[PDB]
Amino acid sequence: FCGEPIDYRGITAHRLVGAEPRPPVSGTRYAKVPGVPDEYKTGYRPANLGRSDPDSDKSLMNIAVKNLQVYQQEPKLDKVDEFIERAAADVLGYLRFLTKGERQANLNFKAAFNTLDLSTSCGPFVPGKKIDHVKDGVMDQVLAKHLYKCWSVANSGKALHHIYACGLKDELRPLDGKKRLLWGCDVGVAVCAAAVFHNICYKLKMVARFGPIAVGVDMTSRDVDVIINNLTSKASDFLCLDYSKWDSTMSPCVVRLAIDILADCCEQTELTKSVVLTLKSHPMTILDAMIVQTKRGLPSGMPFTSVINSICHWLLWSAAVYKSCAEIGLHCSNLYEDAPFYTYGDDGVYAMTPMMVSLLPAIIENLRDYGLSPTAADKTEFIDVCPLNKISFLKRTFELTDIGWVSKLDKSSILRQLEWSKTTSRHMVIEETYDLAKEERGVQLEELQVAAAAHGQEFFNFVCRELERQQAYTQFSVYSYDAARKILADRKR
Ligand SMILES: [Mn+2]
Ligand SMILES: [Mn+2]
């Protein structure tokens, strides 16, 4: 499905042949709640500013093309080294011990399809969402044709087309031109990968509180306590990192190793063989009538992105320390055990041993030399160690209460839910909306109270003062401070 080469702004692309075009969705679902006082505003804006961005050139196709260029750059690492190889042995030993040596069964078709959520686009080959083809309990003709072919091919062990549908992620971003792309996965790759990786990932999700892979953790529960106790079980210094341009710069050799590691304890069938071969191949994406090939990166819509990304992080964080130990003449090993750490995509929190604190400059540089761009989680200061009462993970800070440990979403994330609302219609600019009397907004604004309560009565009151004004716009309840506080407590215990 590549025809004749395109050359526009510096991307290597081709005219889409053999498939229908997949035009990206313009505009944004987000719109402004009317009458919001200025003290509640935080400065965030939709990623697709539209005609609210003065530069006329900043059109969707240009923006997407600009952000795709990055993925066509040659990767930092061409091959994995000895420290990443050491770290891979750790992950392998963690999984082999988790699974008790037993291989995880493939799901059959029905079970795998059932794991896909109804509201997901079907990828570049089938229009609409999953649910637009599975109405009266059964699949329609188009989806079934496509899914039977993919399933047949995959069970013969041959790889599938690792193709996605391109677009701009519709989300709120600060006032600063990098912007996240949408990698809408082909439904056939999705079902096949779900058949192969769901059982091992279900097992990982149960054991998420212990980590290192945090995918599945519940930041509102006792999970938080086991996360924190574990961090302080071996150290009294910590590191909180986030990474810029993570997805877009990931090296194939690392991604490929992550996939091999995750499939190691899977049932060794032809379907697994096919899924491994598919996800390991350089992913392509269809912008409109153009198909674009990549040279680096991990598509954030790859089936099981979070876990696979989390293995990459484990590999790279553990190698960076191991490399830094080697330079000082030390052999370091078993990092995840000796210095417990957690990982959720590009987000991580690590225990720092005295030796590791001393090796901090060399570790950040070793992270740089693997192609990553580390930054402090506390998005204000430089990278340094941060104490117990300062740790940050998954946009949440922590506080030791009588009901164990308690997590607080950063105040801005709460506040922006008062300023913005994810409407069901596309807006071509920043503007206000009155279509706010929806059940989904209601459950969001009641939940927002439980979120705010964690910051104290004064913040709760500040938020509720605006929430009480929005009760004319949305059918919902405003709890008392005590009532909300009882909900946090109930969610733990
Ligand atoms: Mn980041
Ligand atoms: Mn992050």
Swiss-Prot record:
Cofactor requirements of the protein: Mn(2+)
Domain RdRp catalytic: 236-360
Lineage: Viruses, Riboviria, Orthornavirae, Pisuviricota, Pisoniviricetes
Disulfide bond sites: 325-332
Biological role: Replicates genomic and antigenomic RNA by recognizing replications specific signals. Also transcribes a subgenomic mRNA by initiating RNA synthesis internally on antigenomic RNA. This sgRNA codes for structural proteins. Catalyzes the covalent attachment VPg with viral RNAs.
Reaction catalyzed: RNA(n) + a ribonucleoside 5'-triphosphate = RNA(n+1) + diphosphate
Residues reported in the UniProt entry to bind Mn(2+) 2: 242, 346-347
Residue sites binding Mn(2+) 1 per the record: 242-243, 346
Organism: Rabbit hemorrhagic disease virus (strain Rabbit/Germany/FRG/1989) (Ra/LV/RHDV/GH/1989/GE)
Protein name: RNA-directed RNA polymerase
Parent-record interval covered: 1256 to 1752 of 2344
Transmembrane segments: none
